[PDB]
């Protein structure tokens, strides 16, 4: 049975951090839903790339739960995720069911906002460290990808492939991750 991924897409999301995991997960045979935070309409990402979501978050939630919930970064995208009651509910449910939560760049600051995964070892973009560490609720890592149980975090656009492949390995195993990796021409 195919694994299912929910990618939450807010205005100001970093488009590279959105597209690389969506694409790589689809290469791995994962059923991915790109879900628009604000509804069904196109989303203007941080560098003005416009992505049309597969569905509204409201609609995608009805088809839950998911094997992974993915939070892209981008400062303004993460702030929108952080402020969302819908996101809070989704992450709480996911954590409670021991499902994977994956967040990159400023994305992990939404975990702080929603009180998710406290005590975890996490990374973020270097510029997001102070925000993430406010209160000392996590332990900070400079690893490019940090997986602490079911909280999987990463640093930036340049770690997006590693982040995506870690999700793939978590859901579908090491062999599938290696097979998906080889055609990408990664270093």
Phi, psi of 23 (to 5 degrees): -65, -55
Q: Is 175 exposed, middle or buried (CB count within 10 Å of its CB: 0-12, 13-18, 19+)?
A: exposed
Total length of the chain: 187
CB-CB contact of 10 with 43 (8 Å): yes
Residue 151 binds which of Cl ion, ligand 73F, a second copy, none (CB < 5-8 A, kind-dependent)? none
The least CB distance from residue 128 to ligand 73F, in Å, is 4
Tell me which stretch binds a second copy (CB under 8 A): 45-53, 62-70, 78-86, 112-120: 45-53
Rounded distance between C-alpha atoms, residue 67 and residue 165, angstroms: 15
For the question of residue 105 being annotated catalytic, the response is: yes
CB-CB contact of 114 with 88 (8 Å): yes
Tell me which stretch binds a second copy (CB under 8 A): 44-52, 58-66, 88-96, 168-176: 44-52
126-185 residues in contact with a second copy (CB under 8 A) are 126-127, 144, 155-159, 161, 183-185
Q: Which is nearer to Cl ion, 46 or 94 (CB)?
A: 46
Residue 132 binds which of Cl ion, a second copy, ligand 73F, none (CB < 5-8 A, kind-dependent)? none
62-121 residues in contact with a second copy (CB under 8 A) are none
- Active-site position among 52, 105, 114, 137: 105
CB-CB contact of 38 with 17 (8 Å): no
CA 96, chain centre distance (Å): 17
Q: Which is nearer to ligand 73F, 105 or 166 (CB)?
A: 105
Q: Which is nearer to Cl ion, 69 or 78 (CB)?
A: 78
The secondary structure element, H or E, covering residue 161 is: helix 160-172
Among 153, 4, 147, 150, which residue's Cα sits nearest to residue 78?
153
Binding site for a second copy (CB under 8 A): 14-16, 19-20, 22-23, 26-27, 34, 42, 46-52, 125-127, 144, 155-159, 161, 183-187
Instruction: Give the catalytic positions in this structure.
Output: 105, 125
């Amino acid at each position: 049975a195919s694994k299912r991924a929910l990618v939450i897409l807010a205005k100001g999301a970093e488009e590279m951090e959105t597209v690389i995991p969506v694409d790589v997960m689809r290469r791995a045979g994962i059923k991915v839903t790109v879900a628009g935070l604000a509804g069904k309409d196109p989303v203007q990402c941080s560098r003005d790339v416009v992505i049309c979501p597969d569905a509204s978050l409201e609609d995608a939630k009805k088809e839950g739960p998911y094997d992974v919930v993915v939070l892209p970064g981008g400062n303004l995208g993460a702030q929108n995720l952080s402020e969302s009651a819908a996101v809070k509910e989704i992450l709480k449910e996911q954590e409670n069911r021991k499902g994977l939560i994956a967040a990159i760049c400023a994305g992990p600051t939404a975990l702080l906002a929603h009180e998710i995964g406290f005590g975890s070892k996490v990374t973020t973009h270097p510029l997001a460290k102070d925000k993430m560490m406010n209160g000392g609720h996590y332990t900070y890592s400079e690893n490019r990808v940090e997986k602490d149980g079911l909280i999987l975090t990463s640093r930036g656009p340049g770690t997006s492939f590693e982040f995506a492949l870690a999700i793939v390995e978590a859901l579908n195993g090491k062999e599938v991750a290696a097979q998906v990796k080889a055609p990408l021409v990664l270093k």
